Amino acid sequence: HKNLTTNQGVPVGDNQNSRTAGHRGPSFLDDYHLIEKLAHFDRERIPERVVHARGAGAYGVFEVENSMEKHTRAAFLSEEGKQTDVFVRFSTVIHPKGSPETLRDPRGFAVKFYTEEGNYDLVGNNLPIFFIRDALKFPDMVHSLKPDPVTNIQDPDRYWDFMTLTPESTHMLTWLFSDEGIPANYAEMRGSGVHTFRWVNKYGETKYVKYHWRPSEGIRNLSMEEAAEIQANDFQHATRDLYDRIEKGNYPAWDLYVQLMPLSDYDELDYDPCDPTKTWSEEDYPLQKVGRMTLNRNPENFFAETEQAAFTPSALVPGIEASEDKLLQGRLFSYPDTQRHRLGANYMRIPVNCPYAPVHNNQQDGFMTTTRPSGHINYEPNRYDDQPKENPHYKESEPVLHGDRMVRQKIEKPNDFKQAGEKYRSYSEEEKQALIKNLTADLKGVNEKTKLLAICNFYRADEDYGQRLADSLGVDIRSY
Amino acid sequence: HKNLTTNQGVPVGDNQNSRTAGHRGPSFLDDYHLIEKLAHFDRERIPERVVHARGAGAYGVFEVENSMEKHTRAAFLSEEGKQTDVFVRFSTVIHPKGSPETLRDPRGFAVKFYTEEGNYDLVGNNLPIFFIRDALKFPDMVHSLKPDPVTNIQDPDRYWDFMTLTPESTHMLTWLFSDEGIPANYAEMRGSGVHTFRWVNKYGETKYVKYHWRPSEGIRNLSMEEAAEIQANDFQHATRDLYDRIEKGNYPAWDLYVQLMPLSDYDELDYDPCDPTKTWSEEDYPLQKVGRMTLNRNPENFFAETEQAAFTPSALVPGIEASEDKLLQGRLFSYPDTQRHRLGANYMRIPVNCPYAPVHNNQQDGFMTTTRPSGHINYEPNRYDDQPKENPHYKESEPVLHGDRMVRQKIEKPNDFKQAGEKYRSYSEEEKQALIKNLTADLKGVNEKTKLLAICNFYRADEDYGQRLADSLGVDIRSY
Amino acid sequence: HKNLTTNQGVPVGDNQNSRTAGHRGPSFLDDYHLIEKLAHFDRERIPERVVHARGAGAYGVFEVENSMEKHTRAAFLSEEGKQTDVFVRFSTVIHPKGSPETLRDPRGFAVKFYTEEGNYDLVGNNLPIFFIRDALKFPDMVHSLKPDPVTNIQDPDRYWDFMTLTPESTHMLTWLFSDEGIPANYAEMRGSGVHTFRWVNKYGETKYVKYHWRPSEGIRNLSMEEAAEIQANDFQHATRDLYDRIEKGNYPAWDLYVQLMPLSDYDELDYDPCDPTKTWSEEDYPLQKVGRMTLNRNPENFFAETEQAAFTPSALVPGIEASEDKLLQGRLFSYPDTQRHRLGANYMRIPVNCPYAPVHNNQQDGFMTTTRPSGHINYEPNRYDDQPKENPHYKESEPVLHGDRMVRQKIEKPNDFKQAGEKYRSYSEEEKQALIKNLTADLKGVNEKTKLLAICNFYRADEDYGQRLADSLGVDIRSY
Amino acid sequence: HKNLTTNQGVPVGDNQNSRTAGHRGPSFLDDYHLIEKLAHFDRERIPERVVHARGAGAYGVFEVENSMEKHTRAAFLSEEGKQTDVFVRFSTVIHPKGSPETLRDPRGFAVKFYTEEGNYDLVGNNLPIFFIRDALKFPDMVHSLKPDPVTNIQDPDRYWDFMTLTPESTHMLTWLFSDEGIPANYAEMRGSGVHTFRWVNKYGETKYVKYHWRPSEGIRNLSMEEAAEIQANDFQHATRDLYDRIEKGNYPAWDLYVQLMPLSDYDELDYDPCDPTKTWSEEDYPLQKVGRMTLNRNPENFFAETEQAAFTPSALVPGIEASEDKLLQGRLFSYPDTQRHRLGANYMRIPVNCPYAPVHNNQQDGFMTTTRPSGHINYEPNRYDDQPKENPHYKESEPVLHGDRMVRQKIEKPNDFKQAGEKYRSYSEEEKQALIKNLTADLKGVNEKTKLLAICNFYRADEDYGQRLADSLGVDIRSY
Ligand code: HEM
Ligand code: HEM
Ligand SMILES: Oc1cccc(O)c1O
Ligand SMILES: Oc1cccc(O)c1O
Ligand SMILES: Oc1cccc(O)c1O
Ligand SMILES: Oc1cccc(O)c1O
Ligand SMILES: [Cl-]
Ligand SMILES: [Cl-]
Ligand SMILES: [Cl-]
Ligand SMILES: [Cl-]
Ligand code: NA
Ligand code: NA
């Protein structure tokens, strides 16, 4: 048995009645419990994430099967059997909190590894490429996909206007308008790092790397019809499914694979290996198994742990570095930036965000300083041998720059259409029919000029693709 | 034709490419356009409303048919034909911003009148009563109804635990589990002030008042099955419908009616006329037509106008005052309190929230001061005749207090069950069947002791009501 | 030896050099350490307190010498010898952080007692009365005393305009313009509760109470000349002094005394005993010794503990209640209201603000939730016997209301001049000379009409007072 | 004559009395005027600037004498007689908002030019060099200079520890410990851009540029003793002096001069021309007159205009670009980053911060959206010719990168001591005596090891300098 109390620790005499002038009179200002309780209720909410607002979290463990020391000095990958705790958040993208999990969208697949050398965030999606290749375009892309700023309803005419004028999107749309645009749930789902990263070993040798998560539950997708049937009765089915599997002991898992590519292979590929609109061939760059992640624990509080979770692609650990991918480069900035706004300057002290590794530095103060700081010395260099100092064993690599000027210019070999065609031809006939169907339903109401340009981009990917879509939309493409 | 610019007014040379070390190299920090554009994107979101997060807005006009000056000095009601601009937001209640509009919930019906003596907010719902009668319980009620804080899914076992132990909720639940718990859309929907308010005329005479909005489009409700079928294909159907009606010139309207009751009728009644779990008989207190509101304009920007809209029951105008309703009394505080958090100290300067009537006072500063203040005199009293002064013509009434002590105590004559029974018996057989069906689907999975208490509360309302529910749930109540 | 780390717990390789294109080229965006370290620096500051922005803090102990159980059930005062930890912050009032501690001002004297039944804040000043008697005037008062909103310099013409038109200020001004307006430091300084509070004993009997703190170091004040001399060489001498006394083991102490008055004595006094412009005669209501507070420990971090400290007069404990003092009533609201803005919705979790007594309630979420919440049940009533419940042993008293109606009306018996005259006559001749001298230096440049009104208000206090001021100002008041 | 009103536009009947239970009873919650007025009061303050918190603002005009089009395409410099409106803020550095203006510190000299091609901010100081050359050290340097985080008092032992271990500071300290470390006021003061910038003409030719402001009122300084004499009686003397000069029509002015250097001079010099611890010789790179800035208008409201002013070195206009200076490079980020926290995401819409030039872009939303946004198109590219587009005429230059790797490495030819010695020798004997006096007073109490290292750094600058300081401090340096 426990007393209800105020936040001052005073036991509450009456949690039912306001303080009033007699039993039916107006309410007095001197009712600290009422005002405190209502005032905190009035401040429960924080801004939702600007994208990926809808999602669900879980904790688990990553275990190494094959040590990666030949290729990276990353501590958490250094030996067979090494276990690292994770927190993972899965998500949709475009719509707000509360939106259904039956909508078409990439799915987020964000993994935080609590390593001995710091927290490493691999902020992935299910699909292995993206719509754009430069972060400067991201608020534009998002804005076109988001509900219309007047109507508050998503409008295909808007995002297809953007996408069609942004032909590098063509590969991505060829994945997203398959039925893999609606995963059945978060467990029966692919994961991808999407970007190329750099792996750096103890000799300072660098390889390019891509990451892939393969579900133990397999990949399963929903047709537009299957999605509607679920949406009718449950707008949070994926969140429900994740929690329920874990509560029942049916723990979902993913095997982590990598592809590894020499830096020098740039110059002979007909695409840029750091163009995130591109995948690498699995015949030429085979998947190499690293280990397995099992999710086995539900959070204790959704707001405190899942809503407040902060991941960033710039949370890199020794041995794992960014590539020059211009999309990734903006993400390095944007995540901690938005987090400072969404969560507070001190967001890294929220428990789910805290490292397991020691934190010692000369930062101070900021809203909601709860960590009981002490000491006189908050500056470096200083005369004190016991105060924290830099450790040169932990310098990052020095990537070679091939450019000689500060420029704003598109990458060479954009090759916007080739892999979209390859993906299209890789589909089964049943999968091609679904792609055309889903695209037709999406395009049939859009501005005729935009609809033609869409068809033309898919035609440039593959002639059969573009002709089938034109036929299905009733568009005459003879004059082109 | 216009230049894209930074926020500094510098035309942008290139809105496609980040600044990088050659065409494929990493990104430079000296890219003000990138950083400014990402950083503002990173800050787009504000907190959603703590309740009524999902909603839709429109502007229109309210026109007086019968002047109300014999009963209230309110300026906007003073003359036949007098027109006042309104802004209205409709909403659901429990789930977050992106949640479906097919869910069971009261609907918000919030009307801001831009009167010549200040803004008057009538913050109603469709349903004319509430679950609780004291604001001290509001965070409890809400927390029970909201998604479970662990699972992020709404759980009937939680809110029925609260509601069953809060028997004053019985009248409300008897309305909400009719099919009027799911209005077809926002246009074919009732509105209610819910609370008794005080109307005060130019002689200082006071009457109790209740407000009712009657839709010109009639009232239409959804069954659970009808709601699921809509939910399958559109999770924002009510938002859509409102915008669409107005864009097509099919303007929805409501007639405003009032009931008026003398203060001295308190002892004539077997309930407290200021208990918001109670309605007043329309036979004994007939509806009196006041005027008509027509919504005829969509907002120009949903975030700026609808998301940032702030209504409060305490935005009262001369002639219209709060009653002693202890629920209303807490609302007086909570709304501006939450708005200062959600929107900023200076939220009243946001255009939708601004009055038409002149604002002159000695308040100053606060985040985002955009109003070009001037002058040396920010205090009163002062020696300057031209600075703003109090105006004793605009004093409020002085309600009589019947109590002699500051107490925490439930009102007399709570009468928790009688009107719920009256409402139940007022239903058609088809309506009673839908009530029992909807209750049964909601209660069938809850804790057995809670389920029995629910049945017992409804039995106390009406024996046939409670027995039908018990039969439908398979619960044997012979022995009570 | 310790590593400098990022907030992700990654050791920093180089805390000296930004990451650049060669040894002298422009800086790269991919420099997580630079950006994290700059961004947090960029966010160190929070709003200063709206008043009492300049101050200093210390911890210590309060020990009961005489149990107060005949008069109050407060736990911390129950037993001889009982020791309660305290935190105390002393302050100036008007000017910002960084301002000098040599200025004329009341001084704040805010004591947090960490009691077994919750935190009790006694938020005092050195002077025992105040300028105003209704919180509605506080923003006016402050704005008149604050630097002019155009020039950013304090202007006697502005605050004397307010004070002269606010004749209830006369008693306060008669204390503040003695040399006690500039205490020598925080240790050699009086403290006062200012308001009457209500003490309630185990039988439910109530007495009015006033609190006084008497410095073991005695009271010492600065002349205007002494204050200038200190200001020349140290703008933070009181902060320095408090820290230095404690660091050297010379702990400052205060004895706590109370006056006690029966409720009934209202009706026979020629003032309102809950008017905070009034004192109670020490002859008629003798000081009674309660105990001693000794301050013996400096905080470990000024920002975390002293800057973030939050006190409120509404942090009352069983046995100690607010009086009807209309000034106090507004304070009850204002402090936690400003604190939610200044510090965050969760400011009560900041260590210095935490109670020693257990906190259990159904509040949740809000910015910077750091407390590891858990459990499904965040509402009451609920079916669970182990969840926190109200405890009727801890109900507050039920003060009798003498009023009939909700009114806006000045108290009866304002008696604005009589005590100011009594205070003036209680001064030694040296002390009267100082008062006139300090008043004259303040008023000599003020608007002539305001200057005359000042003289008249002091003349009404005491003829010799007003005449001496008029003489010193060169103002002939014979014609009145 | 005007009514005082609430923020809802309702006239206030009584601005004197709270609403209470009779004339002396406790206060009611239903007092919207009290609560609104106190709530807004409670929220007046925003965070002060993290440095330069104390300052003062004015408006004026800049007029071109000698057009600069041969060297820069900047619009505001394009024609003789061209006038551009400015806003200027002057400041101290280290202590908080209310701190004296008699302290030793650089002075800030921040000029916002409202040009036809956007706002251009030249965020200078009086002194023409800086303590450090990499932004990574800025939070350290500041934390060392700031009041100690335990005592809240500035401690020379802390900042000399930092500075002595940061020998690139030696030139700066040689200026700051002259009497120019305490300017007599803001008018009789030098201004400097400090950094080298790049000027780019219409043919794309680039020169390095330095900016210098020469006061028409001449340069005048205070000795330590003259500063204390002022401080005794006025802790805002420089704020007062600026406002007073302008109010009386005695407008302060500065002539702008530039120095111009070819990029190809790098190897001709024994320092890096982009090292901000360095000046350029005026013999080798003569001062060239541009024009004159006159300050002739005080702001209408200090908070709205001066306190909320936001400047950034990244507010560059076509023709004027950053150099590679690594200190500058971090400032490009830090200012808009801190301003988003201090002022809000929409701080650029605060009037003093608004450009004169048109602003059109696809940014949206954020706290306190006051700008009445409209339209459906918030993304680019789009199909609409009338929506804002990029303008390639306004591309920036493409600086040549000399580096081939991403590195963290000190510049070549740091040359930490030579210019400090040149400055020392440039001093008159009276000036040398002051410098030694001021340094001795500052160093005499610091840790002996730190004090010796200080002397050694000054000795390396000039043997006489170091020897005179050693003699004055009583330190025998014969053994070295
Ligand atoms: C209606 C009258 C008053 C109002 C509305 C008011 C309001 C405030 C506010 C808003 C603060 C800043 C609190 C914070 O930021 O944590 C403050 C601080 C303070 N006030 Fe008042 N005040 C009033 C009267 C008084 C009185 C009568 C006293 C003493 C008897 C007093 C003593 C203090 C002290 C000592 C502080 C500093 C607390 C600290 O050190 O953190 N005030 N006041
Ligand atoms: C890396 C080096 C530096 C960093 C990181 C830095 C950072 C900052 C920051 C964060 C502010 C607060 C701005 C605000 O809140 O709006 C500021 C203000 C200021 N800094 Fe710096 N600073 C640096 C070097 C300098 C230099 C070199 C100068 C002059 C050349 C200077 C002059 C100023 C001035 C004048 C202000 C006040 C502007 C105003 O009046 O509002 N700082 N600085
Ligand atoms: O952050 C994102 C924004 C838009 C689309 C995506 O798939 C995504 O992950
Ligand atoms: O504000 C609200 C909270 C909970 C239920 C409701 O119907 C409501 O309107
Ligand atoms: O909070 C306050 C405001 C004005 C004057 C004071 O003495 C005070 O404490
Ligand atoms: O921004 C700043 C920080 C520290 C010292 C300075 O001179 C400065 O301008
Ligand atoms: Cl650090
Ligand atoms: Cl006001
Ligand atoms: Cl609670
Ligand atoms: Cl944009
Ligand atoms: Na191995
Ligand atoms: Na010329």
One-letter-per-residue 3-state SS of chain C: CCECECCCCCECCCCCCCCEECCCCCEECCCHHHHHHHHHHCCCCCCCCCCCCCEEEEEEEEEECCCCCCCCCCHHHCCCCCEEEEEEEEECCCCCCCCCCCCCCCCEEEEEEEECCEEEEEEEECCCCCCCCCHHHHHHHHHHHCCCCCCCCCCHHHHHHHHHCCHHHHHHHHHHCCHHHCECCCCCCCEECCCCEEEECCCCCEEEEEEEEEECCCCCECCHHHHHHHHHHCCCHHHHHHHHHHHCCCCCEEEEEEEEEEHHHHHHCCCCCCCCCCCCCCCCCCCEEEEEEEEEECCCCHHHHHHCCCCCCCCCCCCEEECCCHHHHHHHHHHHHHHHHHHCCCHHHCHHHCCCCCCCCCCCCCCCCCCCCCCCCCCCCCCCCCCCECCHHHCCCCCECCCCEEECCCCCCCCCCHHHHHHHHHCCHHHHHHHHHHHHHHHCCCCHHHHHHHHHHHHHHCHHHHHHHHHHHCCCCCCC
Residues 204-223 of A with CB under 8 A from B: none
The structure tokens listed for A29 are 């200002």
> Are B52 and A96 contacting, i.e. CB atoms less than 8 angstroms apart?
no
A143/D21 CB distance under 8 A: no
The structure tokens listed for A370 are 């709860």
Which atom of ligand 5 lies nearest, measured to the CA of C125?
Answer: 9
Distance CA C220, CA C185 (A): 8
In SS3 terms, A41-106 reads as HCCCCCCCCCCCCCEEEEEEEEEECCCCCCCCCCHHHCCCCCEEEEEEEEECCCCCCCCCCCCCCC
The structure tokens listed for C195 are 């308001």
Closest C-alpha to ligand 5, atom 7: C106
Tokens 């007909």 sit on residue: A270
How do the residues of chain A divide into helix, strand and coil, expressed in percent and rounded to 5?
Answer: 30, 20, 50
**Cβ neighbours for C318, distance < 8 A, ≥ 6 positions apart:** A10, A11, C73, C74, C75, C117, C200, C394, C396
> Are B368 and D371 contacting, i.e. CB atoms less than 8 angstroms apart?
no
Angle of CA points C93, C169, C419, to nearest 5°: 120
Q: How far is CA A191 from CA A93, A128, A293, D139, in A?
A: 15, 7, 12, 39
Choose among A137, A127, A125: nearest CA to A167. Answer: A137
Q: Specify whether B125 is catalytic.
A: yes
Q: How far is CA D341 from CA C186, D315, D348, in A?
A: 34, 18, 13
Distance CA C94, CA C50 (A): 9
- Beta-bridged to residue C191, according to DSSP, are C213
Q: Specify whether A362 is catalytic.
A: no
Distance CA B8, CA D360 (A): 10
Distance CA D455, CA D304 (A): 46
| Contact with chain A for residue B400, Cβ under 8 A | no
Return phi, psi of residue A17, to 5°: -115, 130
Distance CA B285, CA A323 (A): 75
SS3 of residue A407 by DSSP: strand
SS3 of residue B407 by DSSP: strand
Q: How would you classify the pairing of strands A118-125 and A20-21?
A: unpaired
Distance CA B469, CA B450 (A): 14
Distance CA A343, CA A55 (A): 17
- Beta-bridged to residue B254, according to DSSP, are B215, B293
Choose among A12, A439, A321, D365: nearest CA to C117. Answer: A12
Distance CA A133, CA A136 (A): 9
Distance CA B451, CA C286 (A): 63
> Are B86 and B113 contacting, i.e. CB atoms less than 8 angstroms apart?
yes
Q: How far is CA D353 from CA D115, D246, D312, D346, in A?
A: 12, 22, 11, 10
Handedness of CA A54, A58, A63, A68 (dihedral sign): positive
The alpha carbon of A354 and the centre of ligand 11 are apart by a number of angstroms equal to: 30
Distance CA B316, CA B193 (A): 13
Which atom of ligand 3 lies nearest, measured to the CA of A130?
Answer: 7
- Point out the residue among C56, C153, C306 whose CB comes nearest to the CB of D239: C153
Strands (E) in A105-205, as ranges, are: 108-115, 118-125, 191-192, 197-200
The ligand whose atoms approach the alpha carbon of A380 most closely is 7
The structure tokens listed for D363 are 């940014």
Question: In chain B, which residue's Cα lies nearest the Cα of D27?
Answer: B406
Handedness of CA D178, D184, D188, D193 (dihedral sign): positive
- Beta-bridged to residue C120, according to DSSP, are C113
> Are D198 and D321 contacting, i.e. CB atoms less than 8 angstroms apart?
yes
Which atom of ligand 6 lies nearest, measured to the CA of D105?
Answer: 7
The ligand whose atoms approach the alpha carbon of C5 most closely is 7
Residues 221-280 of A with CB under 8 A from C: none
Residues 320-359 of D with CB under 8 A from C: 322, 324, 326, 329-330, 333-334, 337-338, 341-342
Query: Rounded to a whole number, what is the distance in angstroms from the first to the last CA of chain B?
Result: 79
Query: Rounded to a whole number, what is the distance in angstroms from the first to the last CA of chain C?
Result: 80
Choose among D169, D39, D49, D175: nearest CA to D105. Answer: D175
Q: Which helix (H) or strand (E) holds B18?
A: none
C39/A363 CB distance under 8 A: no
SS3 of residue B57 by DSSP: strand
How many whole angstroms from its chain centre is CA A180?
17
Distance CA B90, CA B246 (A): 14
- Point out the residue among B26, B383, B401 whose CB comes nearest to the CB of C449: B383
Method: X-ray
How many whole angstroms from its chain centre is CA A479?
42
Task: For residue C423, give the amino acid letter.
Answer: K
Angle of CA points B366, B302, B49, to nearest 5°: 60
> Are B309 and B89 contacting, i.e. CB atoms less than 8 angstroms apart?
yes
Choose among D352, D349, D380: nearest CA to D366. Answer: D349
Distance CA C410, CA B134 (A): 31
> Are A229 and B229 contacting, i.e. CB atoms less than 8 angstroms apart?
no
> Are D151 and C234 contacting, i.e. CB atoms less than 8 angstroms apart?
no
Residues 149-208 of D with CB under 8 A from B: none
**Cβ neighbours for D263, distance < 8 A, ≥ 6 positions apart:** D206, D207, D208
Distance CA D381, CA D388 (A): 10
**Cβ neighbours for D443, distance < 8 A, ≥ 6 positions apart:** D156, D160, D451, D454, D469, D473
> Are D71 and D304 contacting, i.e. CB atoms less than 8 angstroms apart?
no
**Cβ neighbours for D59, distance < 8 A, ≥ 6 positions apart:** D85, D86, D87, D88, D295, D296, D297, D298, D299
Whether a cis peptide bond, with omega within 30° of 0, leads into C355 is: no
Distance CA C329, CA A30 (A): 7
Distance CA D200, CA D206 (A): 4
Distance CA C326, CA D114 (A): 50
> Are B310 and B347 contacting, i.e. CB atoms less than 8 angstroms apart?
yes
The structure tokens listed for B233 are 């294909």
Angle of CA points B98, B104, B108, to nearest 5°: 70
- The residue among C323, C364, C378 with the most chain B CBs within 10 A of its CB, best to mutate, is C378
How many whole angstroms from its chain centre is CA B390?
31
Distance CA A258, CA C478 (A): 99
How many whole angstroms from its chain centre is CA B318?
21
Q: Classify residue D232 as left (phi > 0), alpha (psi -120 to 50) or beta.
A: alpha
Choose among B327, B369, B362: nearest CA to B348. Answer: B369
SS3 of residue A461 by DSSP: helix
| Contact with chain D for residue C4, Cβ under 8 A | no
CB of D269 within 6 A of ligand 6: the answer is no
Tokens 């059945």 sit on residue: A184
Distance CA D417, CA A437 (A): 74
Strands (E) in D281-412, as ranges, are: 288-297, 320-322, 406-407
Report DSSP state, residue B191: E
Whether a cis peptide bond, with omega within 30° of 0, leads into A381 is: yes
User: Which class for D422: exposed (0-12), middle (13-18), buried (19 or more C-beta within 10 A)?
Assistant: middle
| Other beta carbons within 10 Å of D228 | 15
- Point out the residue among C140, C374, C404 whose CB comes nearest to the CB of B362: C140
Q: Which of A33, A95, A119, A125 is flagged as catalytic? A: A125
The alpha carbon of B190 and the centre of ligand 4 are apart by a number of angstroms equal to: 16
Handedness of CA C291, C296, C302, C303 (dihedral sign): negative
SS3 of residue B184 by DSSP: coil
Q: Which helix (H) or strand (E) holds A147?
A: none
Distance CA A98, CA A435 (A): 28
Distance CA C177, CA C105 (A): 9
**Cβ neighbours for B249, distance < 8 A, ≥ 6 positions apart:** none
Distance CA D346, CA A107 (A): 31
The structure tokens listed for D17 are 């009395």
Distance CA A136, CA A142 (A): 11
- Beta-bridged to residue A122, according to DSSP, are A111
Burial call B275-293: b when 16+ CB within 10 Å, e when fewer: bbbbbbeeeebeeeebbbb
Residues 365-384 of A with CB under 8 A from C: 365-375, 380
Domains of chain C: 1-480 (2.40.180.10)
C383/B449 CB distance under 8 A: yes
Choose among C398, C399, C394: nearest CA to C75. Answer: C394
Distance CA A414, CA A270 (A): 9
Distance CA A30, CA A8 (A): 15
Which atom of ligand 3 lies nearest, measured to the CA of A106?
Answer: 7
**Cβ neighbours for A357, distance < 8 A, ≥ 6 positions apart:** A114, A115, A116, A117, A118, A119, C5, C9, C10
Residue A153 with chain B: CB contacts under 8 Å: 236, 239-240, 243
| Other beta carbons within 10 Å of C107 | 25
The alpha-carbon gap from C66 to the nearest alpha carbon of chain D, in Å, equals: 31
Tokens 């010796």 sit on residue: D452
Breaks in chain C listed by the residue before each, with C–N > 2.5 Å: none
Q: Which of C125, C185, C298, C353 is flagged as catalytic? A: C125
The structure tokens listed for C320 are 């100690």
| Contact with chain A for residue C316, Cβ under 8 A | yes
Choose among B278, B213, B228, B260: nearest CA to B104. Answer: B228
The alpha-carbon gap from C464 to the nearest alpha carbon of chain D, in Å, equals: 31
Residue B33 with chain A: CB contacts under 8 Å: 136
Question: In chain A, which residue's Cα lies nearest the Cα of C40?
Answer: A345
Q: How far is CA D391 from CA B14, B29, D73, D388, in A?
A: 7, 22, 16, 9
Whether a cis peptide bond, with omega within 30° of 0, leads into B381 is: yes
The ligand whose atoms approach the alpha carbon of C363 most closely is 9
